[PDB]
């Protein structure tokens, strides 16, 4: 298991524009197009992202290309962020993937807001971080995914994904 396989499980793959759990236009492997209520605004973000006139449909190669870019971007946002970078550097390889997963889902700003959990993660207080992570809109809105990510931080193994 790795970050790509982990996010593919959590995000799924859809080749036509769809609404995510929050109701936002999305495509591929959780690639958010726009928070705007307009399907035309989504189609236009999609064409610009892909570089061709898509009419709301992309191929598997194209979905995987956006995915690679988004994972790369999530990693780069962690490393550029003063709050996230030291947590990431402190973590083993498996828990690093859990942090990337969170950033991919909710953005670097959203994750940097988990100040108390991040401190507990840095201190390697795994059971306590797991309890604090669960006290969140994140956990209450997407509990099955959040539980898999929290388990990964708690145990440092891929058991929630096998
Ligand atoms: Cl893009
Ligand atoms: Cl979920």
d(CA 121, CA 99): 10
* Angle formed at CA 37 by CA 32 and CA 40, multiple of 5 degrees: 80
Domain ranges of the chain: 1-162
User: Residue 20 to residues 29, 117, 129, 157: CA-CA distances in angstroms?
Assistant: 11, 26, 27, 28
CB atoms within 10 A of CB 162: 6
Closest CA to 30 of 54, 13, 51, 5: 13
d(CA 98, CA 156): 9
Ligand nearest to the CA of 9: 2
Name the fold adopted by 1-162. Answer: Lysozyme (1.10.530)
d(CA 30, CA 8): 9
Instruction: Indicate which residue of 10, 11, 62, 70 is catalytic.
Output: 11
E-only strand ranges, the chain: 14-19, 25-28, 31-34
Technique of determination: X-ray
Active site residue 10: no
- Dihedral of alpha carbons 101, 42, 63, 18, sign: positive
Residue whose token pair is 């604090």: 132
Which residues on adjacent β-strands are paired with residue 25? Answer: 19, 34
All residues at 6 or more sequence positions from 1 whose CB lies less than 8 Å from its CB, including other chains: 158, 161, 162
Ligand nearest to the CA of 12: 2
d(CA 108, CA 156): 22
Closest CA to 118 of 102, 105, 104: 102
PDB resolution in Å: 2.1
* DSSP type of residue 21: T
Residue 73 alpha carbon to ligand 1 centre in Å: 10
CB atoms within 10 A of CB 59: 12
Active site residue 45: no
Closest CA to 18 of 4, 39, 36: 39
């Amino acid at each position: 298991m790795n970050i790509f396989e982990m996010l593919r499980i959590d995000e799924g793959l859809r080749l036509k524009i769809y609404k995510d759990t929050e109701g936002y236009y999305t495509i591929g492997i959780g690639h958010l197009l726009t928070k705007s209520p307009s399907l035309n605004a989504a189609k236009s973000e999609l064409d610009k992202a892909i570089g061709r006139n898509t009419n709301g449909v992309i191929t598997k190669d194209e979905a995987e290309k956006l995915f690679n870019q988004d994972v790369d971007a999530a990693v780069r946002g962690i490393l550029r962020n003063a709050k996230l970078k030291p947590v990431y550097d402190s973590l083993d390889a498996v828990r690093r993937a859990a942090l990337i997963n969170m950033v991919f889902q909710m953005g670097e700003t959203g994750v940097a807001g988990f100040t108390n959990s991040l401190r507990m993660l840095q201190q390697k207080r795994w059971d306590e971080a797991a309890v604090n992570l669960a006290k969140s809109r994140w956990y209450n809105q997407t509990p099955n995914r959040a539980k898999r990510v929290i388990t990964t931080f708690r145990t440092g193994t891929w058991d929630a994904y096998k």
